[PDB]
């Protein structure tokens, strides 16, 4: 019996109850980024950069 | 019996009840970034940079 990195539970979401009673919702983007309404999200990156709800307006690396 | 990094529970979300009764919601982005409404999010990055609700207006690395 070793259990090397075993029996784990990593990047987990459970038992999520959500109610969203919105009468009006409105997003207006003019250039750039808009991230809206991320719910119950699970990730596990290995040897990499992992974002979830990142937003960047605009990367301008001219020349 | 070793249990090296085992029996763990890392980056976990559970038992989340949410109610959002909003009559009006409005996002207006003009250039740049807007991140709105991240709920019950779990991540586990290894050997990497992990953001969740990052927002950057604009990266301008000219030349």
């Amino acid at each position: 019996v070793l259990y090397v990195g075993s029996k784990t539970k990593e990047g987990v979401v459970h038992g999520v109850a959500t109610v969203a009673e919105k009468t009006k919702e409105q997003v207006t983007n003019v250039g750039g980024a808009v991230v809206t309404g991320v719910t119950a999200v699970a990730q596990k990156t290995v040897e990499g950069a992992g974002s979830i709800a990142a937003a960047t307006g605009f990367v301008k690396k001219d020349q | 019996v070793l249990y090296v990094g085992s029996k763990t529970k890392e980056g976990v979300v559970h038992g989340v009840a949410t109610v959002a009764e909003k009559t009006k919601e409005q996002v207006t982005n003009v250039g740049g970034a807007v991140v709105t409404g991240v709920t019950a999010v779990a991540q586990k990055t290894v050997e990497g940079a992990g953001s969740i609700a990052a927002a950057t207006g604009f990266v301008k690395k000219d030349q």
Binding site: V30, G31, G32, F58, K60 | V30, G31, F58
Partner: peptide, 10 residues
């Protein structure tokens, strides 16, 4: 020459 004008004249 980034431009992101926007108007909401009601």
């Amino acid at each position: 020459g980034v431009v992101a004008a926007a108007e909401k004249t009601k």
